[PDB]
């Protein structure tokens, strides 16, 4: 099916405590495969998957060099952005960056992203055509005229339509046994009493992959409920459940519907006492 | 390790042509923009040209517009500069500079020398300079440089070899003097050894 590779970067300033904190992680689909932490002892790019450890030493040398360049730019950016917003040197602030690319079922380029944020709010983002920027604030407007006069989208477009897709195909080829798998959810339902005149039914779905799933309740064929966020199970799979409170005796009217791409046909669960 | 290496600079005549190169290694060449900076003899740095990462945006300086042409080949990691209709004011040392990871230009080449002149290879003429101190005058040679030594390298303290200046006729000339004690001067005899490689000439002169 479709696949994607993403990179996340975070930088947090620490006034009166030395250098800022830098963290970088890389994800392929829903699986993490690299990480870099400035507070660690190695000061290197470390692998977090079995299929990525078969690369040579030049790969890791290049990765370390480039991530250090990222951190250097982010450390200048913290200062400049503090300058723009008329803020003092007492508080700690955050900058965040994200980019990546998507491929289709034929492993051909579909979309690319590149986004920037300051203190949890959008700052500037590359548009879908990979040639223009979207700046929703006056300071981003100042940045946007500099970036449009200097043709940064040219490097970004070349990278995203080239190297991103090529190495994503390479990674999907290497870690084929893990990255190109689907795990159907092992679903079941429980029942709990809610005093004299009510009960709660809980619909489960455990150990599926990837994280995209849909759990909906239906009473006699009409949509209605408590939903939790898809949570990581800790070993490469995910979990989720949904619950509804029903009047006592009417439990036979409700059904749970599960949709997942690891299933050929959507499953339907009914309460079986 | 990242680095750049220039090649192609030599001696040319006015109206001639040259092609410089700059081979990169140790990084992805197709993600940085490159420039050409030059420095005239005894002057300051001056920007010449510019080309973007994919090669869609090219800019030139006002003094070289219409005569130079920059290009790049991302598949082989190479940068070129085609110089046509050269003038005498184009004599300089040329550097290729890669853009910095945050700001500026932090990777430079070693530099290649380009000489534009209309003079032919000539051997130097050596004349004595005696009135303490004394020396010998090296005049009317081309091209640069010459190496001047005294007593085949035995007299090294007190020798001053001045930088060569370009005469009005397009040729070079320099002087070399030494300060010696007057009594010792009369007894022994000083001589200066001049060696010009591009003309295969060697002159030994007795002052």
């Amino acid at each position: 099916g479709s696949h994607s590779m993403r990179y996340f970067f975070t930088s947090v300033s620490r006034p009166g405590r030395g250098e800022p904190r830098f963290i970088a992680v890389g994800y392929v689909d829903d699986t993490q495969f690299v990480r870099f932490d400035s507070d660690a002892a190695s000061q290197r790019m470390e692998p977090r998957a079995p299929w990525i450890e078969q690369e040579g030493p030049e790969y890791w040398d290049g990765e370390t060099r480039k991530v250090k360049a990222h951190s250097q730019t982010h450390r200048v950016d913290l200062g400049t952005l503090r300058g723009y917003y008329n803020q003092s040197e007492a508080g700690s602030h955050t900058v965040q960056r994200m980019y990546g690319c998507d491929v289709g079922s034929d492993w051909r380029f579909l979309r690319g992203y590149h986004q920037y944020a300051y203190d949890g709010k959008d700052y500037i983002a590359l548009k879908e055509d990979l040639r223009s920027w979207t700046a929703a604030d006056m300071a981003a407007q100042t940045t946007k005229h500099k970036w449009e006069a200097a043709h940064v989208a040219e490097q970004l477009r070349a990278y995203l339509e080239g190297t991103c897709v090529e190495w994503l195909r390479r990674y999907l080829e290497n870690g084929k046994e893990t990255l190109q798998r689907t795990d159907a959810p092992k679903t079941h339902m429980t029942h709990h009493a809610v005093s004299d005149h009510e009960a709660t039914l809980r619909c489960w779905a455990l150990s599926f992959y990837p994280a995209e799933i849909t759990l909906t309740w239906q009473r006699d064929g009409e949509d209605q409920t408590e939903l939790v966020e898809t949570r990581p199970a800790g070993d490469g799979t995910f979990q989720k459940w949904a619950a509804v409170v029903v009047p006592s005796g009417q439990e036979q009217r409700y059904t749970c519907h599960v949709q997942h791409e690891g299933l050929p046909k959507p499953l339907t669960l009914r309460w079986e006492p | 390790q990242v680095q750049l290496v220039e090649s192609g600079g030599g001696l040319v005549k006015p109206g001639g042509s040259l092609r410089l190169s700059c081979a990169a290694s140790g990084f992805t060449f197709s993600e940085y923009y490159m420039t050409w900076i030059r420095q005239a003899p005894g002057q300051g740095l001056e920007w010449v040209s510019y080309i973007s990462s994919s090669g869609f945006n090219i800019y030139y300086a006002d003094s070289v517009k219409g005569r130079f042409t920059i290009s790049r080949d991302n598949a082989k990691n190479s940068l070129f500069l085609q110089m046509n209709s050269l003038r005498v004011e184009d004599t300089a040392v040329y550097y290729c500079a890669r853009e910095g990871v945050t700001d500026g230009m932090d990777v430079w080449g070693q530099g290649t020398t380009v000489t534009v002149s209309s003079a032919s290879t000539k051997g130097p003429s050596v004349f004595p300079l005696a009135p303490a101190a004394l020396g010998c005058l090296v005049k009317d040679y081309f091209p640069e440089p010459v190496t001047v030594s005294w007593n085949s390298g035995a007299l090294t303290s007190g020798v001053h070899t001045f930088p060569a200046v370009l005469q009005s006729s397009g040729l070079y000339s320099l002087s070399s003097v030494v300060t010696v004690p007057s009594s010792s001067l009369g007894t022994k005899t000083y001589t200066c050894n001049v060696d010009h490689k591009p003309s295969n000439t060697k002159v030994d002169k007795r002052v």
């Binding site: 990179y7 970088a24 890389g26 290049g62 990765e63 480039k66 991530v67 360049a69 990222h70 730019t73 982010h74 200048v76 950016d77 400049t80 952005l81 960056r97 980019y99 920037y116 700052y123 500037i124 940045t143 970036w147 200097a150 940064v152 990278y159 190297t163 991103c164 190495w167 | 990084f27 992805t28 993600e31 940085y32 853009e99 990871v101 945050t102 700001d103």
Partner: peptide, 9 residues
């Protein structure tokens, strides 16, 4: 692979 460099704001 990660980018070679990023441009400052």
């Amino acid at each position: 692979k990660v980018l070679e460099h990023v441009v400052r704001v």
